[PDB]
Structure 1
């Protein structure tokens, strides 16, 4: 949601009185402070502190460049950085921010109109921009909301269908009277004054005009007072709440960073009749490897379908069976054939010809650990957090599908691109028979469960957060087993935020029953991730180009 949602002292959209109340009840001490959302400005806040037993409310606007600042004060990249700053320097206020009035018990910020407005746009943005639906849309959103908002805040209004770049009041008027004179028909036209446009809309068969003024901060204003960062937000806002408007806005009067939804993010089946076994004649295989591992080798190739030719990855040699146990293998495959989720390497089908081949979705970016080695200066942490979050989305999926992985590890997290990771080889592990990814009970009692995987995710997090470093480097066999029992876990990676190491730690509880399940893991990894996805950027083609 809000880039202040993680802040333990942020209360969301509470009133000025509610605010004072929480402070009153906290000790009215000098330095007591809380943060909240400005009911009148989109993306803005209000710093509320106590000094000499009296309340002080400072509004915090969001400049057109993304920083936050109290009028006359310094600019800050975010609520977090702002509060961290004034805590060590009054720089204008009655006194430094000292004891924070953290939210009581288990209360969360009070979601308001801007939070609701924000989701709606993102939602209708992906649905719109990539015609996605169902969980697929839900999966796109949950993971890319951070990136989608940025897009929404940079999309030019000149783009929107309701904007008319060269219209006069008289014309717009006759353009609105020219057709379906329905309540809510509207358009926007820029007025002469720099940063001024007019909202022209129909109500009761009559056209109404509303000046839209732009202030010094650039924020767009409605006669009523509410401010927005762009017209589009203002428009969607008036679409729900119609303050100052004679009627809610309705129908319109018409006239770099690779995201995850390009290429097969969605299942290959978008009109089916898919069988488990494929025809070797529909499969084109190369004799050139993409690497190999414990099981067979991986070769690239293409697969032709009734209407499409897709690119695949063939893991030649699954292993092959010697007895009527080729049925058991086929049992698993049957199940895997069902698993469908963007963050997982889907199984297209199996084919038995010169060998027992496993055909999967193409994920050519390579393993997560190879992609991160030596790139600590290239790939920002927020970017790694994003991948670890995608990794838990597939894991939470696989867990609710009662399908244990058994081999979660970096080597098994495959990248489609910089911001798209897929989990692979989920199942082939249990086909036959450096492996410090297993939980203690996997080695101690042959026990495998989603809880067992949550441990491997813990290890994977480490592998990634420490940019491709081998787990428990100075060890191998039992040395680890021992190391574990003695209550020792791996150290917190350099430049790895506390919340992650905290999550990672909970992932390494010896009693699997105490370890979080992926549902909880995924919630936590998201909150962490979202908050990290604010601090601008670092390295490569990020001129926001």
Structure 2
């Protein structure tokens, strides 16, 4: 799984009174995403936060063929979920069924519109830079800004997202977007955004260079990812580096300071933003804390 704590800053038990939730107050439904051993299922959960009100949630759980190895992975996600705590632009934990005699289940915010990529890619027809339902440039700046913030909070809690992409970002009601980690519920052996490298399969289009050549994950080799994330947005859900075969070659030109062109809906400011994020030197490219403001700036400038 992908959202983990920053190793740049290592080196507390589970609070059941605050988190544990009755498997008999939880009603399972359709799968939203299946991966290999994991799956996110849509659920209805009674009085999980408002006494006596039902509530549509998303429950993370194992599926068939998982081993205790997975189960421990899922015990981990809950743990860091509890760590990071509530922010609005990230997915939040609602509660957990960690009782014996039952499947481990982590319950998290449901997002009615799913991941951003597939959402924008569907909105290509209904867009305009400046009529209800339609996407505008105001929205696009806004989403970007929300993720920066989300990424910032995600930093403040000493975490890193080792797979930051528009496909791991969800849209819910009222134009809120939340950073998430599909974790086990994403199969990388079946998603082409993930390239085989040995038996490791990596989101290479998103991965910053230092991460690729060496394997240095940092809040900053994330900004790069976020630069790429910005592209996906102002292309309305287009996959990065079109046509370009991702190979020993690709990686080369990348550190020759070679970047993608501009996406179809980008503004000039946005594109240059994307270009900072894609600095060779991981230090030169801004902090998410700094992107939060520029985008805040840009969002005011778009009326």
State yes or no: 1:312 paired with 2:60.
no
Compute the displacement of 1:469 (Å). Answer: 1.0
Flag the structure with larger Rg.
1
* CA deviations over 1:213-243 (Å, ceiling 9, x no partner): xxxxxxxxxxxxxxxxxxxxxxxxxxxxxxx
CA contact (8 A) 2:32 2:40 kept: yes
Gap change, CA 1:460 and 1:294, over 3 Å in 2: farther
CA contact (8 A) 2:96 2:105 kept: yes
TM-score (norm 1): 0.43
Counterpart Cα distance in 2 of 1:330 and 1:404: 18
State yes or no: 1:438 paired with 2:207.
yes
Q: Which residue of 2 aligns with 1:489?
A: 259
* CA deviations over 1:260-309 (Å, ceiling 9, x no partner): xxxxxxxxxxxx9422x4332222111x2224346622221122347243
TM-score (norm 2): 0.75
Q: Which residue of 2 aligns with 1:330?
A: 75
Counterpart Cα distance in 2 of 1:525 and 1:388: 7
Q: Which residue of 1 aligns with 2:25?
A: 282
Compute the displacement of 1:370 (Å). Answer: 1.6
* CA deviations over 1:63-120 (Å, ceiling 9, x no partner): xxxxxxxxxxxxxxxxxxxxxxxxxxxxxxxxxxxxxxxxxxxxxxxxxxxxxxxxxx
- Tell which deviates more after alignment, 455-464 or 471-480: 471-480
Q: Which residue of 2 aligns with 1:116?
A: none
Q: Secondary structure at the match of 2:161?
A: coil
Compute the displacement of 1:487 (Å). Answer: 1.3
Q: Secondary structure at the match of 1:301?
A: strand
* CA deviations over 1:139-167 (Å, ceiling 9, x no partner): xxxxxxxxxxxxxxxxxxxxxxxxxxxxx
Counterpart Cα distance in 1 of 2:26 and 2:248: 44
Counterpart Cα distance in 1 of 2:31 and 2:72: 29
Compute the displacement of 1:346 (Å). Answer: 0.6
Counterpart Cα distance in 2 of 1:476 and 1:347: 36
Q: Secondary structure at the match of 1:404?
A: strand
Q: Which residue of 1 aligns with 2:111?
A: 363
State which of 292, 311, 315 in structure 1 corresponds to 2:34. 292
CA contact (8 A) 1:452 1:512 kept: yes
Q: Secondary structure at the match of 2:89?
A: coil
State yes or no: 1:507 paired with 2:260.
no
CA contact (8 A) 2:37 2:66 kept: no
Q: Which residue of 2 aligns with 1:242?
A: none
State yes or no: 1:469 paired with 2:238.
yes
Counterpart Cα distance in 2 of 1:350 and 1:334: 11
Compute the displacement of 1:360 (Å). Answer: 1.1
Compute the displacement of 1:345 (Å). Answer: 0.8
5+ residue gaps, structure 1, are 1-271, 535-545
Question: Superposition pairs for residues 95-110 of structure 1, below 5 Å?
Answer: none
Q: Secondary structure at the match of 1:337?
A: helix
Gap change, CA 1:350 and 1:402, over 3 Å in 2: same
Compute the displacement of 1:326 (Å). Answer: 5.7
Greater share of residues in helix: 2
- Tell which deviates more after alignment, 331-340 or 512-521: 331-340
CA contact (8 A) 1:404 1:427 kept: no
Q: Which residue of 2 aligns with 1:520?
A: 290
* CA deviations over 1:391-433 (Å, ceiling 9, x no partner): 111111011111111121111111113522111118779xx99
Gap change, CA 1:443 and 1:391, over 3 Å in 2: same
Q: Secondary structure at the match of 1:274?
A: helix
Counterpart Cα distance in 1 of 2:220 and 2:43: 35
Compute the displacement of 1:526 (Å). Answer: 0.9
Compute the displacement of 1:327 (Å). Answer: 5.7
CA contact (8 A) 2:57 2:107 kept: yes
CA contact (8 A) 2:93 2:107 kept: yes
State which of 416, 429, 434 in structure 1 corresponds to 2:172. 416
Gap change, CA 1:380 and 1:295, over 3 Å in 2: farther
Question: Superposition pairs for residues 126-275 of structure 1, below 5 Å?
Answer: 273-275=17-19
Compute the displacement of 1:356 (Å). Answer: 3.7
Gap change, CA 1:411 and 1:293, over 3 Å in 2: farther
Counterpart Cα distance in 2 of 1:488 and 1:479: 12
CA contact (8 A) 2:257 2:279 kept: no
Counterpart Cα distance in 2 of 1:329 and 1:301: 18
